[PDB]
C-alpha cells in the first residue's frame, strides 16, 4: 500500500512486547555500546564527599525484533519511535547517592539492521572519595561505574561506542572558567563477579579534575601578607609609647578573627593550614618580642 | 549564579508545526476551522536546549490548537536552568551574554527543522511582558540560525538565542563606596588628633581593624580578579600609609 513509513511503524510495533529482551536466540547477549561526554562539573562537596556533574550520554544497542528490509518500505533507512514503546537496558551508576533532574528524551532512532540510537543528558549526583591534602593545587579522581543493576553479562554487556582515546581526550562541549578544570575521562572495562556462575559487566569512567588556585589565592595569601606588613609598620612604634602593645594585641585579634572567618572555606589537615599557623606563630613571637623589650 | 556559572530564567515559549495527518476540510464538519486537542494525544517535536544543566519546574499545558490545514499551535511557559559562561570583569557595570540553543536532541535536519515564527527583529526588540526593577536589565534577545554537524551525512538544525543582560549598579554602589568614603573621612577626622595624645595611634589601629573586617565582610558578595578590588585595595593601602604616617610622626 501507500501510507509510507506509517506501515513500517505498525509492522514493527504491532505485536512487539517491550518486556522481553529483543533477541531471537535467548542465549545471545545484547551488547550496549555507551558513550559519555563531560559537559560541566556542577558542584563538588568535599564535606559530604559527593560530586555533582552533567553528562551527555549515548546508548547504542541492537533490537533483533525491530529489523526490516529498506525495500518495499520506500527505501526507509531509520525510523524515530518513542523510547518507552521499546525495550531499554537498565544500565545505571553504582556511585549514585541521589537522583539528578534531567530532561527526558521521548524518541530514539531505530535503523533497518535493528540498531537503536538513544541520546540523553543525565545529571549525575555520584559519591566520590576526595583528597584535599594539597588544597590549592589538588587533583581529584572520581569513578563512574556503568552497569546493569540486574542483568548478568550473558544478558546485557557494555562496550564503547567509540575509541577510548576519543572518550579520554574529549574536552569539547565542556564549560571552563569554573572552579575545576577537567583533565581526562578514562574509560575501562571490567568483569565484576561476587561469586561463581554470576558475572556482571562494568564500564568504569575515571573523571579527573584539577582545581583552579586563583579564587583561593587572593582570599588566603593577600590578607596574611597585609597584616604582616602592618605588623612591620607596628615595629616602628617606640616601646616607650605603650600603644605598641595595644597595636600587637589588636593586630593579633584581627588575624585571629581572620583565621576564624577563613576557617569556613574548605574542611579537611588541609596542610595549607601549617603554612598559615606559621604566620600565626610569627605574630605570636612578634608580640612576645614587643612585651619583652 | 556567578560562582557556578548558571543562569535561571523564565520564558514564554511557542511551537508551531504542520501535522499532515490532522488535515481536513472545514465543510461537512459544520464549518469548523480549528480544534483543541490534548498535547499528549498527538506527535510532538523533541526540541530542547543544549545549555540545560537541570530541569526547571514549569506548568504543563494540556491542549493545543490544530487547524484544518494541519497547523499545530503549542503554547507553553518554561523555566530554564541553563549553564552560561559569565564575565564579571567590570563588576558593577557588566554586560552578560548567554546562549540558548534550541535543537532536536535526536532528529536530523531532514526530519525536524527549526525556523522563526516571526521576524528576528521582533524577537530581538521584544521587551514586552518582562519584569524590570530587578538586578538585571534585559538588552536584547538575538536569534540566529546555524546548521551544526559533528560529522558528514548527519546534520542538525540549531536555533540560538543570545540573551544579553546588563546589571544595575545601584545596590552594589552604596554597599561598596559609602563605607569606604565614610571610614576615609573618619580617618581625616583622625588626623586632627595631636601626636602627643597617644590616642591617635589607637585611633588609626581601630579604624584599620574596622576597614579590615569591612573588606572581609564585603568579600562575600561576588566571587571572581573582580577589578573593582583594585579600586578598593587602593583605599586599603591608603589607610595603611596613613597609619605609617601616624607612627612616623
Amino acid at each position, epitope marked *: 500500500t501507500q501510507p509510507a513509513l506509517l506501515r513500517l511503524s505498525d509492522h514493527l510495533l504491532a505485536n512487539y512486547k517491550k518486556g522481553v529482551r529483543p533477541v531471537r536466540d535467548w542465549r545471545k547477549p545484547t551488547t550496549v*555500546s555507551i558513550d559519555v561526554i563531560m559537559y560541566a562539573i556542577l558542584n563538588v562537596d568535599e564535606k559530604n564527599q559527593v560530586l555533582t556533574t552533567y553528562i551527555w550520554y549515548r546508548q547504542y544497542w541492537t533490537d533483533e525484533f525491530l529489523q526490516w528490509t529498506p525495500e518495499d518500505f520506500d527505501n526507509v533507512t531509520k525510523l524515530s519511535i518513542p523510547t518507552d514503546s521499546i525495550w531499554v537496558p537498565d544500565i545505571l551508576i553504582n556511585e549514585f547517592v541521589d537522583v539528578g533532574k534531567s530532561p527526558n528524551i521521548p524518541y530514539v532512532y531505530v535503523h533497518h539492521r535493528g*540498531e537503536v*540510537q538513544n541520546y540523553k543528558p543525565l545529571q549525575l549526583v555520584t559519591a566520590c572519595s576526595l583528597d584535599i591534602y594539597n588544597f590549592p593545587f589538588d587533583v581529584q579522581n572520581c569513578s563512574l561505574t556503568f552497569t546493569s543493576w540486574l542483568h548478568t553479562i550473558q544478558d546485557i554487556n557494555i562496550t564503547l561506542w567509540r575509541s577510548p582515546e576519543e572518550v579520554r581526550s574529549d574536552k569539547s562541549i565542556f564549560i571552563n572558567q569554573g572552579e575545576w578544570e577537567l583533565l581526562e575521562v578514562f574509560p575501562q572495562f571490567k568483569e565484576f563477579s561476587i561469586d561463581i556462575s554470576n558475572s556482571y559487566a562494568e564500564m568504569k569512567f575515571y573523571v579527573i579534575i584539577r582545581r583552579r588556585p586563583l579564587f583561593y589565592a587572593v582570599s588566603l595569601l593577600l590578607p596574611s601578607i597585609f597584616l604582616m606588613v602592618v605588623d612591620i609598620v607596628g615595629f616602628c612604634l617606640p616601646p616607650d609609647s605603650g600603644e605598641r602593645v595595644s597595636f600587637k594585641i589588636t593586630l593579633l585579634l584581627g588575624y585571629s578573627v581572620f583565621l576564624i572567618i577563613v576557617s569556613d572555606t574548605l574542611p579537611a589537615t588541609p596542610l595549607i593550614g601549617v603554612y598559615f599557623v606559621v604566620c600565626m606563630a610569627l605574630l605570636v613571637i612578634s608580640l612576645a618580642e614587643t612585651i619583652f623589650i | 549564579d556567578e560562582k557556578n556559572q548558571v543562569l535561571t530564567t523564565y520564558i514564554w515559549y511557542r511551537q508551531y508545526w504542520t501535522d499532515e495527518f490532522l488535515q481536513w476540510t472545514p465543510e461537512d464538519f459544520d464549518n469548523v476551522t480549528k480544534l483543541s486537542i490534548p498535547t499528549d494525544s498527538i506527535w510532538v517535536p523533541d526540541i530542547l536546549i543544549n545549555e540545560f544543566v537541570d530541569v526547571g519546574k514549569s506548568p504543563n499545558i494540556p491542549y493545543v490548537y490544530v487547524h484544518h490545514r494541519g497547523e499545530v499551535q503549542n503554547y507553553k511557559p518554561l523555566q530554564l536552568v541553563t549553564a552560561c559562561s559569565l564575565d564579571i570583569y567590570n563588576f558593577p557595570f557588566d554586560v552578560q551574554n548567554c546562549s540558548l540553543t534550541f535543537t532536536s536532541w535526536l532528529h536530523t535536519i531532514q526530519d525536524i527543522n527549526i525556523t522563526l515564527w516571526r521576524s528576528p527583529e521582533e524577537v530581538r526588540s521584544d521587551k514586552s511582558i518582562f519584569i524590570n526593577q530587578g538586578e538585571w536589565e534585559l538588552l536584547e534577545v538575538f536569534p540566529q540560525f546555524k546548521e551544526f554537524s*559533528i*560529522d*558528514i*551525512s548527519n546534520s542538525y538544525a540549531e536555533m540560538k538565542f543570545y540573551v544579553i543582560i546588563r546589571r544595575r549598579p545601584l545596590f552594589y554602589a552604596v554597599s561598596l563606596l559609602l563605607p569606604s568614603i565614610f571610614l576615609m573621612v573618619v580617618d581625616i577626622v583622625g588626623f586632627c588628633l595631636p601626636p602627643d595624645s597617644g590616642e591617635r595611634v589607637s585611633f588609626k589601629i581601630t579604624l584599620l581593624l574596622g576597614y579590615s573586617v569591612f573588606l572581609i565582610i564585603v568579600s562575600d558578595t561576588l566571587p571572581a580578579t573582580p577589578l573593582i578590588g583594585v579600586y578598593f585595595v587602593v583605599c586599603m593601602a591608603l589607610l595603611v600609609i596613613s597609619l605609617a604616617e601616624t607612627i612616623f610622626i
Partner: nanobody
Amino acid sequence: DVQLVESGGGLVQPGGSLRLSCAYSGSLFSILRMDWYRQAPGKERELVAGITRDAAGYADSTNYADSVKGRFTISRDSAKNTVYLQMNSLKPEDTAVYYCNADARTITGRADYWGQGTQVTV
C-alpha cells in the same frame, strides 16, 4: 557495513571538466572523513582531496594535494547522501582510476571503507 559507489568517470580531452560522485549507504553509520584517491596503472595510490568538519561544528574543511591544489574542488551533499569531487582543467597526469575512501563509524566500530572506483582518462 557502509557501501560506497563511485560514478561520473569517463573520457575527456585535456583542459576539460568532470564531476565525480561517491554515494554512501547503509543502516547506522557516521562518516567522519571522506578522502578521494586515484591510482594510475602501475603507479601507487595518490591522495587527491579530503573533507572533514572543522573544529567549529558548522562549516567544513577541505584538504587538497599540491598537485590538484587549484584545479580540483571537493564538496558534499548530506541530503542526497553523496560526496562530490569537481575536477576542472584536467591534465593528462590526472588520468587514473578514482576511488573514494570513507572513514566511518558503525555499531561494529570505526573503520575505513572503499568503493569500486571509476576510470578517468584524459
